Amino acid sequence: SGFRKMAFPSGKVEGCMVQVTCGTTTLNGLWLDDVVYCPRHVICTSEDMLNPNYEDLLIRKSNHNFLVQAGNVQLRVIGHSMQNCVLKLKVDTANPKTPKYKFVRIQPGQTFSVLACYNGSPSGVYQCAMRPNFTIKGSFLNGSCGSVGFNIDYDCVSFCYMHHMELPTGVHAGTDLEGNFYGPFVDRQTAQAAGTDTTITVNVLAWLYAAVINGDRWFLNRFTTTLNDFNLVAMKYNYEPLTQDHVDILGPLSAQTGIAVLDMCASLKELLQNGMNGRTILGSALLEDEFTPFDVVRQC
């Protein structure tokens, strides 16, 4: 019993964190096999950030301009290339601690663990979700760039995020490990803002099924709803539309608890209307949206 916001064990990723320095700029890199991946803005000064021409800034760099440190050992850069917004630094040593891994691009609503790092050294691990507005509500200070997001389902680390920037509202933006940003963001100090964020409806429903599995039923009601009526109501509370895909994904949880997906949608509608009236659901006074249907099945 119990339901916690749980991150994947970070050991497999800790053994990949390195420090990357280019001139006065220092950030984190992910060392997998003989390549170190890091945000391309490591080649920029603060002045370069307004309108950087990365191709032009990079052509002026040689391999020895990049200093890569793995623990107390300096790795030798023997090649460099740019792929979208990530810089790939070929090194002369393959990481002996390279786990079984893949690069995966996630969709909004997906969760992942973040291993926050500074100077190539891991500081902490926490659980995140890719928000519908493509930002993540992280905990990142200056120097955290290059920290990564991942999932570890069955011994294989799936890297899904690399941290690049903090937006004005204190939320965070980054790329997949191929260097493509999540969201309409760019690695430029231009006016950028997070779009209006919404609640990940399918995740709130998953969490309500987690609460039922753990013995709580106070929020259930005798009502059901159509999918369209639910969406009309939910959008008024800034909730993401629930699609037929989401209803299908919640099938296993619906079968386990005996509560049909549209019956749980009716409880959610009522919770949005009434609030909790001094009660809690899994130790929370707010509806939690950073647990996916998959995370619920994994934990419960």
218 binds its own copies (CB under 8 A): no
5 binds ligand OWC (CB under 6 A): no
Q: How far apart are CA 205 and CA 292, in angstroms?
A: 9
53 binds ligand OWC (CB under 6 A): no
Choose, from 38, 85, 145, 300, the residue flagged as catalytic.
145
3 binds its own copies (CB under 8 A): yes
The identity of residue 231, as a single letter, is N
| Biggest distance spanned by C-alpha atoms of the chain | 69
187 binds ligand OWC (CB under 6 A): yes
188 binds, among Cl ion, ligand OWC, its own copies, none (CB under 5 to 8 A by kind): ligand OWC
Q: How far is the CB of 268 from Cl ion (least distance, A)?
A: 10
First to last CA, the chain: 8
Other beta carbons less than 10 A from residue 270's beta carbon:
15
Give me the sign of the Cα torsion angle 115, 117, 121, 124: negative
Among the listed residues 54, 140, 159, 219, the single contact to its own copies using CB under 8 A? 140
**Residue 41 bears catalytic tag:** yes
Q: Which stretch binds Cl ion (CB under 5 A): 34-42, 102-110, 133-141, 288-296?
A: 102-110
Q: Which residue has the tokens 């209803």?
A: 247
Q: How far apart are CA 284 and CA 290, in angstroms?
A: 12
DSSP of 180-218: PBSSS--SSSS---PPPP-B-HHHHHHHHHHHHHTT--T
Among the listed residues 144, 231, 257, 292, the single contact to ligand OWC using CB under 6 A? 144
Among the listed residues 76, 94, 156, 170, the single contact to its own copies using CB under 8 A? 170
* Run of H or E including 112: strand 111-118
106 binds Cl ion (CB under 5 A): yes
Q: How far is the CB of 278 from Cl ion (least distance, A)?
A: 10
Window 98-137: residues binding its own copies (CB under 8 A): 115-119, 121-128, 137
Q: Which two tokens stand for residue 137?
A: 């509500």
Other beta carbons less than 10 A from residue 3's beta carbon:
21
Q: Which two tokens stand for residue 158?
A: 């799936």
What is the binding site for ligand OWC (CB under 6 A)?
1, 41, 49, 140-142, 144-145, 164-166, 187-189
What is the binding site for its own copies (CB under 8 A)?
1-12, 14-15, 115-119, 121-128, 137-141, 143-144, 166, 170-172, 214-215, 280, 283-286, 298-300
Please give the positions annotated as active site: 41, 145
